[PDB]
Structure 1
Amino acid sequence: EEFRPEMLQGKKVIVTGASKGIGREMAYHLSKMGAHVVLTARSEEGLQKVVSRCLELGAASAHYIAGTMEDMTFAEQFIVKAGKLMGGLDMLILNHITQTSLSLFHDDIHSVRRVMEVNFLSYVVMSTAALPMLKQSNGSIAVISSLAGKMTQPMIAPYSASKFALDGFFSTIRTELYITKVNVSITLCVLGLIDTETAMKEISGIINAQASPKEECALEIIKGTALRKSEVYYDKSPLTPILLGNPGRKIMEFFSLRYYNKDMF
C-alpha cells in the first residue's frame, strides 16, 4: 500500500536532535500531518522556536525537554517523561548526533568514546525505555544513519563506527522482535549528503558533492517509518540502495535462523 499523511494524525511521536537539522524539519512535517510530538535537544532556546511553529503548522500537541544525550540518565528519563505527556508512544525517531568534523583520525580516544556514547549508546538506551510503550501501540522506531554507516569514507572514522554499530544492533533487535512476534518495527534510515547547516559547513573545502534537501529527506524518513520498511535509502543516486542494499547479507541472515532452537523464541 501507499502513504497517506492521515497515517500520522493523532500519533504520539518523539524526535531527538529536533533543534535544527533534518530532525527539526521532521518535526514540522509531523506537525502538518497533525501528530502529538515531544521534541528534544540541548538548546532550550532553539527547541522553543520550533515547538511553537509546530502548533502553528497544525500539531495536535507539541512539547520540548532540554538535555544532553551524553548522560544515559536523562536519555532514559526523557522517554518516560515524554511518554507521560502524550499518554502513550507511537513513534520513536532517534536522530541526534554529537558533533563530528572531517579529519584524519589521530588519537582522540575521548572524542571517540563520546561519539559512541551519544550516537549509539543513547539510542540503545531510549529504545529500551520506549519498547514497552511501543509494544502497546504496535509502534515503530526510526534510527537515523548515514551512507557512512553502510560503507567507508575517510576522515570520519569514529562517526562511522557509531553508525555501523547502529546497523548491527538494531538489525538484530529488529529480527529478534519479529521472531518473538512483537509488532514493533525498526527502520534504519540510510541518508546521503543533506542540505543541513551542519553538514555543509563541515565539508566545506574538503568534499565537494551535491547535497539533497533537508525537508524532502525528512518526509521520506517519516513515510518509510510509517510504512514499516526495514531500510530507507535517501540519496541523490538511484543506485545507492542497490549498491549498498547488500542482498548477500539478507540471504545469510535468513539461512542463519535455520540453526536456532525455535523454542527459544
Structure 2
Amino acid sequence: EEFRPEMLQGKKVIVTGASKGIGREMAYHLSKMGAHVVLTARSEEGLQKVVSRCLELGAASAHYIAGTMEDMTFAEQFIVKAGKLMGGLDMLILNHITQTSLSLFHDDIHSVRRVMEVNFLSYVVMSTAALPMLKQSNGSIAVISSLAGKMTQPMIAPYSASKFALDGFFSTIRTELYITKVNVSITLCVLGLIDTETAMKEISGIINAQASPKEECALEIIKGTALRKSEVYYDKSPLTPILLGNPGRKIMEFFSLRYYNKDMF
C-alpha cells in the first residue's frame, strides 16, 4: 500500500503536455524510475530536449510525437503510435490544456468551444483509444484537474467548465470499470496552484496566492496513479481535500448502485 519506484520500472507510460511544467517533471521522475515513456506537446524542440534528458536520467526508452490536441485525429493516432512504439501501455497521463487567460467571461463562445475540445474531448478520444491496451496490462489513467474542477472562481469560466466535465465523465468510467470487474484504475488529480511559468504568468497582477513546487506535484501524481487511488489532492493547505472531497456525493454514489439491475454489469 506504500509506493515503491520499482512499480514503474519497465512500465510503458504516455505523458501529454510533456514539453514543460508538471508534464516535463513527470517525464523526468518516470525516466529516473526506469520506465518507457512516449511524450507529446506541440513543440518539437521542447520535446526533443525532454526526450534527450529522459534518456540521460535512465529511461528504458523515450520517444516524442508532436502535434496539437485540438485535432481529434492526431489525439487518437498518437495513442495507436505510442502503443506500437512501446509494444503496449501501463499508464496514460492526460496532462495537457489549451492556453487560458484570466478574464471575466464576456462574449467568448469560440474560447469555450476550443477549451472543451482540447481540455475535455481529446481526453475522451485518448482514454477510448488507450483502453484495450490498459485492459490487457491492468493499467491506469491519471486525469489532471484543479481546485477549479471541484469548485468555482471568477475569471476561468471555460477552463472550470472543462475540468468539471472531466470529473463527470471520468468518475462514471471509473465506476463502470469497477462494477464490471475491469482492473483499470482512474486517478483524478485535483491540483492547487503550482509554480510553473504558465500558472505564475497567468495570475500575475490578478491573484496573490502561494504556489506548490512542480517537482513534488509531479511525483505525487505518479505515486497516486501507481497506487490506484480514485483521487489525489495536491495543494499547500491540508484543508483543501477535506473541503473539496465532498463526502455527501460519495455517500450518494455508494447507495446509487442499489437502484440498478445487476444484470447490466
The TM-score, its normalising length taken from structure 1, stands at: 1.00
The TM-score, its normalising length taken from structure 2, stands at: 1.00
1:63-92 superposed Cα distances (whole Å, 9 cap, x missing partner) = 000000000000001000000000000000
Cα offset, 1:6, TM superposition: 0.6
Cα offset, 1:21, TM superposition: 1.2
Q: Does 1:105 align with 2:97?
A: no
Q: Give unpaired runs (5+ residues) of structure 2.
A: none
Q: Give unpaired runs (5+ residues) of structure 1.
A: none
Cα offset, 1:240, TM superposition: 0.6
Mapped to 2, the partners of 1:26 and 1:153 lie a distance apart of 27
- Identical columns (%): 100
Q: Matched residue of 1:52: which SS?
A: helix
Q: Matched residue of 1:66: which SS?
A: coil
Cα offset, 1:215, TM superposition: 0.4
> Mapping of 1:1-265 within 5 angstroms?
1-265=1-265
Mapped to 2, the partners of 1:164 and 1:23 lie a distance apart of 21
1:98-129 superposed Cα distances (whole Å, 9 cap, x missing partner) = 00010000011011100000000000000000
Cα offset, 1:241, TM superposition: 0.5
1:13-62 superposed Cα distances (whole Å, 9 cap, x missing partner) = 00000010101100000000010000000001100010000000000000
Cα offset, 1:187, TM superposition: 0.2
Q: Matched residue of 2:40: which SS?
A: strand
1:181-231 superposed Cα distances (whole Å, 9 cap, x missing partner) = 000000000000001000001100000101000100000000000000000
Cα offset, 1:12, TM superposition: 0.2
Cα offset, 1:232, TM superposition: 0.1
**Aligned length in residues:** 265
Q: Matched residue of 1:159: which SS?
A: helix
Q: Matched residue of 2:208: which SS?
A: coil
Q: Matched residue of 2:259: which SS?
A: coil
Mapped to 2, the partners of 1:111 and 1:102 lie a distance apart of 12
Moved over 6 A (4+): none
Mapped to 2, the partners of 1:262 and 1:38 lie a distance apart of 39
